[PDB]
Amino acid sequence: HGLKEEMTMKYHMEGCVNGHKFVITGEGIGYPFKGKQTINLCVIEGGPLPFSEDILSAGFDRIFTEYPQDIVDYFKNSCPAGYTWGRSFLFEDGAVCICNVDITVSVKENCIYHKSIFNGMNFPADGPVMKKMTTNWEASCEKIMPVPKQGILKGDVSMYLLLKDGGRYRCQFDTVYKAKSVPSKMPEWHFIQHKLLREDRSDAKNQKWQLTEHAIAFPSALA
Amino acid sequence: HGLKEEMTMKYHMEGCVNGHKFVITGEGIGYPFKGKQTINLCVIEGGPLPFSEDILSAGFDRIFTEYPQDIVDYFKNSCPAGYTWGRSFLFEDGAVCICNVDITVSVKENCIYHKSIFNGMNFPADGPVMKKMTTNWEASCEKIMPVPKQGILKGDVSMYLLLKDGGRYRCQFDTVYKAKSVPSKMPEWHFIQHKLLREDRSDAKNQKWQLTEHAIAFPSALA
Amino acid sequence: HGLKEEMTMKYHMEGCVNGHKFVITGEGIGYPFKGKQTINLCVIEGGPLPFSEDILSAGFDRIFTEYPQDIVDYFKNSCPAGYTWGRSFLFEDGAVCICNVDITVSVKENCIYHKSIFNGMNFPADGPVMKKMTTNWEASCEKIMPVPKQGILKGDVSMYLLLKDGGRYRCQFDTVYKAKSVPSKMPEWHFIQHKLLREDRSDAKNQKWQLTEHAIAFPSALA
Amino acid sequence: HGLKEEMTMKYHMEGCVNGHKFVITGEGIGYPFKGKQTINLCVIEGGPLPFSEDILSAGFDRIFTEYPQDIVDYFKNSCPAGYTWGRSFLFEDGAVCICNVDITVSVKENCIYHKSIFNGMNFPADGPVMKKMTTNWEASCEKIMPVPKQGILKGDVSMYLLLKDGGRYRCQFDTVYKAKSVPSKMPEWHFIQHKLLREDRSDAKNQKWQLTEHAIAFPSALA
């Protein structure tokens, strides 16, 4: 579908969180069929961010999911034209974010482009996000489900951002995934398990960090 | 504060709802001290809109609130520099929107400028917003609360959008209002009642409409 | 309708909060047409309660609401047979309660009886409820709406429990009110403003407290 | 822990849903180490129920979960004294239920006893629960999390009840699990996948049905 075992990618995110504007760019290398990716981000406007970077992590691609042969891979089937997705983030302390992403494969470059718009508000000044008290998202299991009359998928995952003191901070992710062309095949409902990690790489020059994700699709374990 | 009994205003909104991009411009006339306004909107890009216009109505100014003398008017006080606000809209069927607005008074024009960004997603294709089945918002009572030590306000109002068949469709609004300069005076908590009405004005050529709002601040009725 | 200007009432509540069982009895005197009541509660089983007594307050009667003559008084019209109500309490930190109440007028004794079942859970051990850090609910405005063709009302109020440190703790109330017998008349939607106050009266032998409420119904102030 | 390869169980549930009171009794057989159970329910008061029986299904035991040897089994370690649990059910259309269950093993009888109290409200008259339009819960993945320093667990699962017309009706479950004796060992966080199936067995004398469940615990799939 215009894809190879190893690919590069590019990222552009513009956002506003609690009224703070920012632009982030980045690049990475991934293995679409192994569901693995490693990416490096740099805050080119609005740095240093007054809020935890961890809230942005999921806003930077389900092409990078190891799918078994007997589950339709809606995301690779959408390539190379690609797909768009929209996601709401509902945090336990009343904060709300929305992210929209447009994904396109460049077959000429073997490179997957990502353009994001990220908007969020109502993070309490004294909460773990504005106080930068977060460390990493916990590993998760997302439910993926088809909307057959519409040729789109929905995702549903209850997420936990782990805190410096050892506590957890919950966020409900609800996602709509939409191929750019009408799919011939639709998957049945299944799960995707994720593990996403951040490592800071900031220095005198820029705020920057590395994200790594490993994702695998699974059917229900029950016969 | 650079305000007069009668003023004009200008509106620019850019947004995206369920992946549909659009731009809307507008102008009107209002009476700040009476808490009354009438505005006319024009869809300039992305029309006709594939969703109900009603979801957008509150995204286009608490300066137009009648305040009694013994309640601090945070919004008028913030003039002529103005203020900003951010709102989440949580609909009963899972849809989520976020709107950010920047408001500033041109004393030389006697005009209030409003620039807004509206994003929304997860409106069901068969729901009243996508099927354009709504008529008007019901009149409402918003609670306004000061945030101690941050010089900002929060707003909380449970809204109902009335449907062509006599139903109601609920949306929870949560707002943060922030003056561009530190306030010297902060209000105690109070209510604001609103009545917001839409009248279509669409050609065979163009999508356009008028909005009127009347808003009044009140303390608790129980003494 | 079996009602007088001054009446007595009786209360029996059984409940479980965070797995703690309790039984509470009470009595009071009220003024139905003036919207005022004072009641006295005594924990006869499960005392002293390991949670804030304030969560229980709204679980012990809209008969005690001053209605203007131009709004239908559904609650008084249901008497003397009475009415039942069911309410969910959704707290900002994830705690959830439900309460069900059965209300009947005894004309022989000029006394309104209240039988309630209160269930709640997921109050965090470190939170204001389990640490008894609450003082009183802030005054409120509830929206009351008729349900076309079911002979019932729905109430919607966003409540705030004031904290010892001066903070607020939010809870969303959603109520279903159901006259025992079919009403001849239904109200249009309106507001009810409430003010509810608690005074501790515990002694050497029982946990005890007094509650007072004043409630008045109003149309929209904008017509 | 007083457990055997094959065991029997007894149930008693008392409840009220939208004001309708009921009593259910039941009996089953199960295989704790294989995570399988089959139970038969009989409505002994308040039959036939005016709501879908499917909302009750999860209210009738995590002892019945196939556990990896390398994950601490909180539930079997609590036996034979047993454990209790509380759960909130937040449906997408605003209905709310709470269930509390007390579980205990009779070693003499090789029998697991369950006593439940189920209360729910705000199911819309025209919704799939009151219109009995549901067929079965879809198979799920619950996240199970230890609570540091309290010796309890929390469960979080986003559940979907399948409808006759092929649609889905969403419910968020949040559970608190509490061993009767303070545990010496706590598990790390993990998943439990479930599949729960209902078959109606109603005759002219009683409303009756069968439930089967298969549940397996898993760690995160990712390294």
Swiss-Prot record, chains A, B, C, D:
Binding partners and assembly: Homotetramer.
Domain of life, source organism: Eukaryota
InterPro entries found in the cross-reference section: GFP, GFP-related
Gene3D superfamilies assigned to the protein according to its UniProt record, in alphabetical order: Green fluorescent protein (2.40.155.10)
Keywords (A to Z) from UniProt: Amidation, Chromophore, Luminescence, Photoprotein
Name of the protein described by the UniProt record: GFP-like fluorescent chromoprotein FP538
Biotechnology section: Fluorescent proteins have become a useful and ubiquitous tool for making chimeric proteins, where they function as a fluorescent protein tag. Typically they tolerate N- and C-terminal fusion to a broad variety of proteins. They have been expressed in most known cell types and are used as a noninvasive fluorescent marker in living cells and organisms. They enable a wide range of applications where they have functioned as a cell lineage tracer, reporter of gene expression, or as a measure of protein-protein interactions.
Tissue-wise expression: Tentacle and oral disk.
Protein purpose: Pigment protein that is yellow in color.
Magnesium is among the record's keywords: no
Post-translational modification: Contains a chromophore consisting of modified amino acid residues. The chromophore is formed by autocatalytic backbone condensation between Xaa-N and Gly-(N+2), and oxidation of Tyr-(N+1) to didehydrotyrosine. In addition, the residue N lysine undergoes cyclization. Maturation of the chromophore requires nothing other than molecular oxygen.
Organism for this UniProt entry: Zoanthus sp. (Green polyp)
Family matches, as Pfam families: GFP
UniProt family annotation: Belongs to the GFP family.
Gene Ontology BP terms: bioluminescence
UniProt KW Metal-binding keyword: no
2,3-didehydrotyrosine: modified positions: 60
